Structures are given as C-alpha cells and as structure tokens.
C-alpha cells in the first residue's frame with residue numbers, strides 16, 4: 370500500500386500570495402498522483418490529474434508539478450474561496466490511496 | 476525532478492593544493508552529470524561533460540569522476556584563476572536540473 | 582483475393598480485438614492484487630502491445646494468475662499473427678519467383 | 685495427416701513438456717543460491733512461458749549456471765517451436781496457392 | 788535482380804530511416820514529460836535499435852503517448868523487416884532446391 | 891547434403907563464434923566505464939545468449955558505445971540465424987509436401 374505523506378498539515382498564507390502543498394509517496398509512482406479540494410460540508414473536487422494536467426472549470430491559478438516520489442500542488446494569488454482541505458491520491462499501484470490532507474488557511 | 480546537492484557550499488584551499496567539489500543526485504542517474512564554471516560577472520563554462528569527459532580548451536588539471544548518485548569535480552594545483560562558482564547539471568531525466576553551486580576560495 | 586492475404590488481414594483484425602479485450606481483461610484481473618500496476622486501461626493497452634510484440638520493456642507486467650493467463654493469450658496472438666504475416670510474405674515471394682522463372 | 689502439421693503438434697507437445705520440466709529444473713537449480721527468486725514452481729512455470737516466448741518481462745530470471753543452462757533450453761525450444769509453426773503456415777499457404785493457380 | 792532480394796534491401800533502407808526518424812521523434816515527444824529518460828538523441832537511437840530488434844533491455848522506454856506511438860511504429864518496422872528477410876531466405880532456399888531437384 | 895541444411899549449420903557455427911567473440915568484446919569495451927556491469931566474461935557470455943535470443947531479461951546490458959555496437963552485431967546474428975533456421979524448416983516442409991503430392 371503506497372503511503373502518501375502530506376506535510377505540513379496546516380498551511381498559513383497572506384491573501385494574494387503563492388502557496389505550495391506537498392505530497393511524498395513511499396515509493397516512485399511516476400506522475401500517477403491527483404489532487405482534490407474539499408471545502409467545509411462539501412465533497413471532494415478533482416483539481417489536478419496526473420500531477421500536472423489541469424481540469425476544465427478549475428481556476429487557472431491552480432497548477433501541479435513533480436514526478437516519482439515528490440509532488441507539489443501550487444496556487445497563485447490565494448484568495449478566500451481557496452480556504453479548504455487538500456488531498457493527494459495515487460493510482461500507480463493497487464489499491465489507490467489518499468494523503469492525510471492539508472488545510473489551507475489565510 | 477532530480478535534486479542535485481552540492482556541499483559544502485564554500486570551499487577553502489591553499490594555492491597549489493588539490494580540491495574536490497561534490498554533487499549528489501536524489502537518484503541514480505548514470506554518468507549524466509556535467510560541470511560548469513562561472514566567475515564573477517561571467518557566464519557559465521562547460522568544464523566536464525558526462526562526469527569525466529574533458530573539454531578542449533580546458534586546463535588539464537580539471538578532472539571529474541563518479542557514477543550513479545555520487546560525483547566529484549577535482550582540480551589539481553589550484554590557482555587564482557580557479558576562483559569562481561561551480562555547478563553540476565544532470566541530463567538523465569526531464570527536466571534538466573542544476574546544483575545549488577559551490578564557491579571556490581583560496 | 583488470395584488466401585494468405587485474407588488470413589493476414591484476419592490476423593490483424595483478431596490481433597487488434599485481442600489487444601483491446603486484453604487491456605480490459607488485464608485490468609479486471611489485476612485490480613484487487615496488492616502491488617499490481619496493470620490497473621488502468623490506457624497503460625494496460627500499452628502493456629498489451631508490448632507483450633504481443635514481445636518487445637518486453639519490463640515497465641509493466643501481470644502478477645496475478647488470470648493476468649498471466651491473459652498475458653499468454655496476448656503473447657501467442659502476437660507471435661502467431663506476426664508469424665502468419667511472415668509466411669504470407671514468403672508465399673507471395675515464392676509465387677512471383679515462379680512467374681519470373683517462367684514456371 | 686500431412687507432415688508439417690504433425691510436426692507442429694509435436695512441437696507443441698514438446699514445448700509443454702519442456703516448460704514443465706523447465707519449471708522443476710529451474711527451482712531445483714536456483715534454490716541454494718542466495719538472492720535467487722526462481723525458487724517456487726508456480727512462478728517458475730510463469731518464468732518458463734515468458735522465456736519460451738521471449739516476451740522477457742525481467743521480473744524473474746536465473747542467476748546460477750544450471751539455471752541459465754535450463755533457460756537456454758527453454759529459449760531455444762520456444763524459438764524453434766514458434767518458428768516451426770511459422771514454417772507450417774508457409775507450407776500450407778504455398779500448397780493452396782498452387783491449387784488456386786491450377787498447378 | 789530478383790524481387791524478394793530487392794524487397795529485403797528496401798526493408799533495410801526503410802528500417803534505418805525509421806530508426807533515425809524514430810530517435811528524433813522519441814526525443815521530441817518525451818522531452819516535456821517529467822521523469823522521462825528518452826530525452827537525448829544518442830541514447831534514443833540506441834533505444835530505437837533495441838526496440839526494432841525487440842531485444843528489450845528495459846533500460847529505456849517511452850512514457851508519453853506519442854512516444855509509445857512512435858515506439859509501435861519502430862517495433863512493427865523492426866518485426867516486419869526481419870520477417871521479410873526470413874521470407875527472402877525461404878524463397879531463395881526453395882528456388883535452389885527446385886534446381887537441385889531438377890525441377 | 892542440401893543447401894539450406896548446410897546454411898543452418900553454418901548459421902550455428904557462426905552464432906557460437908559471435909557469442910564467444912561477443913563476450914570477449916563486450917568486456918573489453920565495458921570495463922573502463924563507471925557503473926558498467928558487463929565486465930566479467932562468464933556473465934558477458936550469458937548476456938550474449940540473452941541478446942542473441944532477444945529473450946531480454948534486462949539484468950545486464952551495455953552502457954558504452956562499442957558495447958552497444960557489439961550488442962547490435964549479436965542481436966542481428968541471433969535474429970538472422972534463428973530466422974535462417976525457420977526458412978530451412980520451411981524449405982524442407984515444402985519439398986516433402988511436393989513428394990507427398992506426387993509432384
């Protein structure tokens with residue numbers, strides 16, 4: 370079972386600033402990582418697939434990068450609607466697994 | 476993204492002595508490392524390619540060695556014109572990346 | 582048209598069909614097995630092709646029994662198909678040589 | 685029946701026999717060698733098939749001398765057998781073409 | 788000269804052309820994909836050869852879609868070319884045997 | 891004896907010769923290259939065989955230019971030789987079928 374480590378758990382940033390969420394896999398998994406956003410009382414939302422690919426309907430400020438065991442979800446000019454929980458998920462080996470999540474805080 | 480770790484950042488040596496710069500990759504990359512020299516206000520200069528291969532026009536005192544994750548750039552009888560910044564670069568996996576550099580000091 | 586040609590096409594149609602079924606079946610068989618990689622269709626399709634051609638990159642391979650069974654079918658179809666083409670090329674070459682030799 | 689067909693079957697019977705003996709022999713030869721993986725029959729059987737077909741996944745391979753010797757026998761049987769089938773297909777295709785050409 | 792011979796040469800010229808175009812295309816397609824290794828022409832040329840021959844070492848392989856597409860073309864050209872030579876050798880061998888049998 | 895048979899033997903003698911020269915040359919070419927594994931004759935001999943047969947295990951492969959050149963020669967000899975045998979089997983099968991068909 371691939372282990373995805375998200376750290377720090379909580380992230381604090383000032384409005385407008387660029388922020389970077391981190392996800393490290395217990396083993397090389399290519400670019401088979403994906404990001405989801407979950408706001409309070411809401412369900413998960415695919416933000417980035419296969420590490421970097423963007424999803425239509427998702428603000429262009431959201432971008433991702435990395436490969437192997439290190440991945441980063443980044444967000445330019447952070448704004449209040451960006452306040453929620455982030456999670457990573459790998460599809461490299463069965464079974465799929467999730468990160469422990471990271472809370473964004475402005 | 477392969478990470479190249481150059482350490483120490485600063486190196487101090489006595490004229491004429493042999494010196495060794497170090498570069499370690501976050502993963503095995505064969506011998507796909509290359510060295511560049513950059514003196515104050517000057518641009519980078521290819522010193523050694525594919526770890527050991529010498530470059531015409533480059534003082535014979537410059538040699539390199541290593542493979543996999545450990546590489547060393549060496550310089551015999553160091554002299555004042557050798558005072559500048561060193562950097563390593565890997566071409567094993569996309570994208571190419573650079574070391575954080577090492578400053579030579581006599 | 583002639584027989585060996587018809588059989589070559591037949592080999593190609595079937596090969597494509599086996600590669601596709603091959604991808605579906607591989608995934609269905611591999612998911613559920615901890616540590617397995619043959620678990621998404623796109624790459625499973627690419628694994629199929631590698632296998633049929635026997636180019637064997639080694640970046641993907643089954644680890645479960647049905648997966649390997651599926652694998653065998655793909656390997657044989659690949660080998661058989663490419664071999665049947667080689668024979669088709671030989672027959673064509675033998676026939677023409679007969680003509681060119683006024684036989 | 686005809687000869688090449690009979691020989692194809694013969695090739696298949698033998699191939700199966702060599703794959704099985706191949707699995708047994710591989711294990712007998714590999715166990716005892718520190719670091720070896722070809723040490724349980726089920727996978728050794730799957731290693732055999734990979735080898736005969738030359739699909740070469742690289743997830744399993746011998747490391748001892750007899751293991752490699754056994755390996756060679758399997759590779760040759762695999763290559764020979766599949767090649768003998770290709771020839772069988774060519775002969776069949778050549779013969780029919782003779783008929784269809786009223787020769 | 789004869790047809791199968793001419794076709795063999797043709798196969799060799801094309802194979803070389805596909806290996807070269809293969810190297811260029813592989814690099815063009817792989818650069819830009821994080822973690823990719825098929826990113827310098829020299830090795831991409833060597834990857835091509837491995838692939839065409841299906842010797843599959845597994846030290847280099849594409850990871851992007853066009854890369855794999857390119858890969859398929861190389862594999863097929865390799866398999867087809869080497870198979871067309873095998874047929875060429877068969878035709879030559881069949882023709883001579885006809886002579887030696889005073890047919 | 892006949893021609894294709896004689897040529898098959900010839901293919902086998904040469905193949906063995908190329909495998910041996912192949913081992914020597916591989917080592918001579920690989921030693922000196924940091925990180926290389928094709929550096930002792932015994933395994934280099936086993937690497938040769940893998941290569942000629944294209945079974946490609948991926949446990950050993952060249953990393954220097956001459957090593958890869960040597961590798962190519964081995965791959966081609968392996969492919970050519972095994973292909974020339976396949977043709978030999980086809981000719982034999984075609985000739986007998988002619989007899990059995992009272993032609």
Ligand code: NI
Pocket residue numbers: 993
């Ligand atoms: Ni006749």
